[PDB]
Amino acid sequence: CFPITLKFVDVCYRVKIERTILSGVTGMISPGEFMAVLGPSGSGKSTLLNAVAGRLHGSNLTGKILINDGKITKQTLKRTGFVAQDDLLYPHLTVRETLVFVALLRLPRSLTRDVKLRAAESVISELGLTKCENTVVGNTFIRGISGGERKRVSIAHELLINPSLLVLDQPTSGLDATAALRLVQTLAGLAHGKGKTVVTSIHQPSSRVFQMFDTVLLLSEGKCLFVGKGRDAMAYFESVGFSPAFPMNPADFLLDLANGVCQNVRQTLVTAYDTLLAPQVKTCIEVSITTCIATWFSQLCILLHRLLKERRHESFDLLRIFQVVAASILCGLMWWHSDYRDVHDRLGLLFFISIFWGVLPSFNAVFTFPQERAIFTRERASGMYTLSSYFMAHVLGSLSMELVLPASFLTFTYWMVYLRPGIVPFLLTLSVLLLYVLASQGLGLALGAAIMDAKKASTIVTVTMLAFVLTGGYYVNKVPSGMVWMKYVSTTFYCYRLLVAIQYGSGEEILRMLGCAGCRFVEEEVIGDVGMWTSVGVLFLMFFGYRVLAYLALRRIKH
Amino acid sequence: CFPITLKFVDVCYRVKIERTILSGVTGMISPGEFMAVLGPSGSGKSTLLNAVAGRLHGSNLTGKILINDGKITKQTLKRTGFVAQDDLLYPHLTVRETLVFVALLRLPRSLTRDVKLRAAESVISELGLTKCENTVVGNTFIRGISGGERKRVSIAHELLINPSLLVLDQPTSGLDATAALRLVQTLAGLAHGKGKTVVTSIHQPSSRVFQMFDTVLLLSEGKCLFVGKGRDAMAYFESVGFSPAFPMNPADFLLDLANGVCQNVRQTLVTAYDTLLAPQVKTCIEVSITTCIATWFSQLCILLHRLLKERRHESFDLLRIFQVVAASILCGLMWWHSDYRDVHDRLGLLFFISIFWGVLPSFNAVFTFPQERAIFTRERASGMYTLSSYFMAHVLGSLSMELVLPASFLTFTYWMVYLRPGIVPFLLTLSVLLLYVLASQGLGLALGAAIMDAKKASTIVTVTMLAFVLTGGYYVNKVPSGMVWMKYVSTTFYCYRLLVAIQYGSGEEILRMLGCAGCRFVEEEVIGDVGMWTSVGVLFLMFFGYRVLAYLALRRIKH
Ligand SMILES: Nc1ncnc2c1ncn2[C@@H]1O[C@H](COP(=O)(O)OP(=O)(O)OP(=O)(O)O)[C@@H](O)[C@H]1O
Ligand SMILES: Nc1ncnc2c1ncn2[C@@H]1O[C@H](COP(=O)(O)OP(=O)(O)OP(=O)(O)O)[C@@H](O)[C@H]1O
Ligand SMILES: [Mg+2]
Ligand SMILES: [Mg+2]
């Protein structure tokens, strides 16, 4: 156990459209207590819950928000559960597969599997989800579960973390009259039977749901009108002058007073709060090893299989492989019947392969992290997993299909053109082309993680790659000697220098075959200047270096 | 007036996970009548409302859904308003700007402006939106209006069309107890004061909201338990054997019977419905000029200014122009001090400009229609605007920034390299490069409209453009004569042939300057074979032809 006492004193919040959203909201909620935050629409009660959760800060917010007499630490955000108002889930897992991945990641690890699975399916039977558990969670384009079943998957998503402070933002909207009573009876058993601290906002409770709250907060356009016990609310407003004509729901009467339609009703109740109850609240706020490298790897295995079955359907594209294959038959027919002695044509084949496999991996990889932006952000604030195992699961998860496409391109082009016979110069050509595809993929990952949308990022990578083609070593013969150093930054340069070295070597065979346009051209472009091992040792430095800079760009995003 | 009588007889709906969602739902709602669809979560009442709206069809749905004794026609979907459960709005318009664009497009056109604007702001004062009207509607990443204010913008969005059948899917979820009473009192004034047909589903009504419905439908796992007047519901279930112990809300008692927790309750009430009330429902279902080209243009002007102020902020990028400018200084320095007589180097400059400005417009344009997919789909089913004025507003809206980038690229490169002096060969080079940018943009628009997401589509366009580079006319000298026809499909071919013709002409000056590698190379590649006017007349055929095929690919999407 780790009991949280929450305090918030004089919380204000301005925004620039200057509009005051919250102004002077003081309260305190203890462990063992279930509090409701009532109010009209726009009164500010999802800005107040979003500041005591720790997801709203800056120079707009002003006021002391205290969790056990201290600031909001990184330690206290691991014991806090926050169920937001909009639901962000994966559109391809089923309801049971969604709630097993949460149970394996977040439950105490010194606990056997098949007990973590009998915790995930005793939550399904408490929320009534045992009819749609084999149904896929959908989105706007994939039709799946209901809106009231999607709401209860998100509450189960936080009820499997076992929090110490549970903050919910309208959990009963979209639920009928019987499912909303049972959910409030569940949350009242956490507060009264386990000693937790539950804060919730709620819109249309019945007279039976309203009798289960220990404490009511009533907002009205950013200023509170009542803080105290729910069984004192109707007897407070009678002593100020307001009472219902016909007997009715007490939660219907308190929302007429907050709208001011209970027959200056609002401004009477604001200054009557600041002289009768507001001083006595701030008087009450004065006193009241090898088991560590197994948790990294098991988080990696869960995050792999979760992303392999996102791409199971909507993917396994034969369309990507039947188009790269037709482009390799197309290149192999343009250079059908070219000869080994024609050096000027063979170096234009080898430079087009460098253009093709620098442009194609790099432009595809710019979609990887921007297409995860809303769900990565939400799960980073929860504390689900570390970043170095989320990152490494996307490195290893892309690497299968990214290596089948260059290997099937080159099997057609190498033997139709009939470049150089032997199994040894074929496999060296295959492995240089697979090291260049991985170094070109990491350029697109780093620019998609720094710029977090794909339309803005796939403009920066198109101009950057066309500048690597220009300084890559084919287009200009004399460069101004003061711009010769720019080719040592280009990835395209080090691949094209390695493919020419496998085919023609260090001269010395074409120079005896071409005799010695025949012996002048083959001394600037065939002989070369960068060694064969330093062109390999720099494509490894761009392999690791472009994935380090993609990790540091994702490290920024925090809340 | 055009009164709609809605009927639906024996509606079934199966889905393949075989699961029966709806089975045998018979009802009839007349004009002047306000009907509520009650039920638990997952009982199927948003599948039933989504089939009588006309947005759900196929081989799964089976049953006669009739609107004035006929099928769902294209004419009846113009008089129908459907407020869905999730809200899809533009994240950059304010609340007032959202509701003025709807009033100008959808109100009767033979009606003066400043009366269409006093219709848009008398709806704001009926829904209580007169505090957030100057606040921007947000999204998940832009913080804007509330969730209960977003719900009422969507109801106002359909209350400005003046429908004849209004179908709403949970309109009071996210609203407090006083705003939910006023909204039901608004919808009851449309049905009883104007003679419309309102169908709504609703979750937790109070005892005062429940007394405003004329007709109740009660579902329970896809089978109806009661159809009839709301003031006969409690007296019906008493005569079968069910009655509340303590006096309570009648809408709370009917949801206990549908969940079966009212103390085989459900299966008793299903077979008691099919012998007592279900035969008497189907007995009742037996009887009961130049003003046309001004509406095209005013829809074009509203759709332009709506999309120009979506790109006002999040855009006006100096980042796109400061990077294209640096790439033009970079090209102009690589070919600084190259001479006019060196023909083999100048034709490698001119081919790199063809690569740069075919790849850059085409890859950016693949995001245009896929980033509008959810909102284009919703407004296409409403009948907001025609497609040929939505399409033409995106042609004219992109064309400003797409022509400033090639014109500022070429001002640096043409005079640093110092290609050919004269203002006349400069402007011919500028206009050929602007005709090729528009023809390359239309290739990306057609592949983004046919494939309706941008990650799948920006793989098809990368391999297609690298195949236009290969057959574009630089890489291979002898092609197998049986593949010479493929260059006449490439866009890159016709630009590169036009830039060589402006610089060197029809030979006849370099041949006297180079005397006659000097007179052999300049006869395959400088002389050329395609005329100067047929290279212009084919880039106009690919200009119009690639925007026709993008219109026909958007014509598919309908509901
Ligand atoms: N494409 C689908 N595949 C499988 N099941 C589906 C599909 N679409 C809907 N369902 C199921 O149909 C049932 C009814 O769904 P629907 O959304 O129509 O009910 P609802 O009454 O609107 O629920 P709520 O009140 O929670 O919004 C749900 O149990 C849902 O799981
Ligand atoms: N970034 C912002 N800029 C301008 N106004 C804002 C911003 N954020 C919130 N508001 C305004 O603050 C008011 C309160 O918003 P909030 O969402 O906190 O209220 P709420 O009680 O949760 O409403 P609901 O009950 O409808 O969900 C709203 O009127 C909203 O328009
Ligand atoms: Mg639903
Ligand atoms: Mg809100």
Residue numbers in the entry:
A (entry chain A), B (entry chain C): 35 to 51, 80 to 325, 336 to 360, 379 to 606, 620 to 662
How do the authors describe this structure?
Abscisic acid (ABA) is a phytohormone essential to the regulation of numerous aspects of plant growth and development. ABCG25 in Arabidopsis thaliana has been identified to be an ABA exporter and play roles in regulating stomatal closure and seed germination. As a ‘half-transporter’ with only one NBD and one transmembrane domain (TMD) in a polypeptide chain, ABCG25 forms a homodimer as a functional unit, similar to other determined ‘half-transporter’ ABCG structures including the human cholesterol transporter ABCG1 (hABCG1) and multidrug transporter ABCG2 (hABCG2)39–47. In this study, we determined the high-resolution structures of ABCG25 in Arabidopsis thaliana in the apo, ABA-bound and ATP-bound states using cryogenic electron microscopy (cryo-EM) single particle analysis.
We generated a catalytic mutant by replacing the glutamate residue E232 in the conserved Walker B motif of the nucleotide-binding domain (NBD) with a glutamine (named ABCG25EQ hereafter). The ABCG25EQ mutant had an almost abolished ATP hydrolysis activity, which is suitable to trap ABCG25 in the ATP-bound state. We purified this mutant and incubated it with ATP and Mg2+ before cryo-sample preparation. An EM map with an overall resolution of 3.0 Å was finally obtained. Clear densities were observed in each NBD, fitting well with the ATP molecule and Mg2+. ATP forms intense interactions with residues from both NBDs, thus pulling NBDs close together. A section view of the electrostatic potential surface reveals that the intracellular cavity observed in the apo or ABA-bound state disappears and the transmembrane region of ABCG25 is sealed to both sides of the membrane. ATP binding leads to closure of the NBDs and such large movements are transduced to the TMDs through the three-helix bundle formed by CnH, CpH of the TMD and E-helix of the NBD. The extracellular gate remains closed at this state, with Y564 and Y565 forming the plugging residues. Thus, the ATP-bound structure of ABCG25EQ may represent a state during the transport cycle when the bound ABA is released from the intracellular cavity when the extracellular gate is transiently open, and the extracellular gate closes again, ready to reset to the resting state after ATP hydrolysis and ADP release.
